[PDB]
Amino acid sequence: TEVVYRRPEARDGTRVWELIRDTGSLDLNSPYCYMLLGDYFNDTCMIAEHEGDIVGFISAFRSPRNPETLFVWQVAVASSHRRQGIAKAMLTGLMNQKACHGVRFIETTVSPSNMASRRLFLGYAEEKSIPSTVTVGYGAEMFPDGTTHEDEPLFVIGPFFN
Amino acid sequence: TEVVYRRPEARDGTRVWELIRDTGSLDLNSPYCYMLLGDYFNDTCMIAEHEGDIVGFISAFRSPRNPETLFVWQVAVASSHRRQGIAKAMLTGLMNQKACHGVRFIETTVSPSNMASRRLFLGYAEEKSIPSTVTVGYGAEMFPDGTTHEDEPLFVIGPFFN
Ligand code: NA
Ligand code: NA
């Protein structure tokens, strides 16, 4: 049976946090963070559902200083649903949303070992004939001593319209 | 010597995360989250510094659906600097920022056991003669099973201008 796509709600916050946590690899925010996103940012976020389980999430916001830029924060797809095109469908759903009107750039950061995200963003640009630019973003050394976190290179997609 | 107040930067992200973590009580987001706030949201955030240490932080954003409302996310003051008026000075600094122009409401959520925040927001409204309204916000049951998190009642301050 099919995968369903919708805007999240504050009450999804806990299941979103579970998804992110079960991924193992991703930077995990507080459950409250996911509720706020469900509440205040849900016009520019996306959930994927299959047989009533959350199997995908994208969080994004429009940059407050430069609202023509959408920043994509997290992309998560459950293990059990890899390689079925879900990340690509979320991102495409998201850019179709009415709250993405007037956006001319996508901006995001992709960790070295996140190869799905690298593929998603480069492929999105390539399939739509939009420029993509990759530069130094945040360095590993900006992260706290206890952990060992990777670099977060910056990806800018565009200009385009909408 | 005095406490200094400024907008944060992406490179403060790690020290902000340390402050939040050392507080013990607060919902801790990922270091990356604090960097994004330093980067994309810093016009509506605030740092407090004393003898080059971070001793206070406020995070906020303008609601994307209702940009006349500022939502205040986290308020943190280091243990060692309680009861010296820092939270009040941050919040007052923040509302003076040029990116708070045209704001007519403050909205936030305060946990039951966070008595400093309760005092800050109720006192801010009372000192400025602005209405304050308190209602049910997020319930404890919306949080994940493993933890035991409290309610987050909603505080709305206003209308006012600016
Ligand atoms: Na354009
Ligand atoms: Na007003």
Show me where the domains of chain B are located: 1-162
As given in the structure block, the two tokens for residue A103 are: 């956006």
Breaks, C-N > 2.5 A, in chain B lie after none
Q: In the 8-state DSSP scheme, what is residue B67?
A: T
Q: Using a CB-CB distance cutoff of 8 angstroms, which residues of chain A are in contact with residue B31?
A: 27, 143-144, 147, 149
3-state SS assignment for residue A130: coil
Among B28, B64, B99, the residue with its CB nearest the CB of A41 is B64
Closest C-alpha among B66, B64, B71, B50 to residue B121 = B71
- Cβ-based burial of A126 (10 A; exposed 0-12, middle 13-18, buried ≥19): exposed
Among A17, A73, A149, the residue with its CB nearest the CB of B144 is A17
Class of domain B1-162: alpha beta
Q: Using a CB-CB distance cutoff of 8 angstroms, which residues of chain B are in contact with residue A64?
A: 40-41, 43-44, 61-62, 99
Q: Write down the experimental method used for this entry.
A: X-ray
**Do residues A99 and A44 lie in contact, with contact meaning Cβ atoms separated by under 8 Å?**
yes
Alpha helices (H) along chain B: 13-22, 31-40, 86-96, 115-127
Q: Which of B136, B138, B145 best tests the A interface by mutation, with the highest count of A CBs <10 A? A: B138
As given in the structure block, the two tokens for residue A131 are: 């420029």
- Cβ-based burial of B101 (10 A; exposed 0-12, middle 13-18, buried ≥19): exposed
Closest C-alpha among B79, B75, B50 to residue B60 = B75
Type of residue numbered A49: E
Q: How many CA atoms lie within 13 A of A80 on its CB side?
A: 9
Type of residue numbered B80: S
Q: In the 8-state DSSP scheme, what is residue B1?
A: -
**Is B142 within 8 Å of A35 when comparing Cβ atoms?**
yes
Instruction: Tell me the nearest-neighbour CA distance from B71 into chain A, angstroms.
Output: 9
Ligand-binding site membership of B118 (annotated): no
- Cβ-based burial of B30 (10 A; exposed 0-12, middle 13-18, buried ≥19): buried
Rounded Cα gap, residues B128 and B133, in angstroms: 15
Pairs of CB atoms within 8 A across A/B: 80
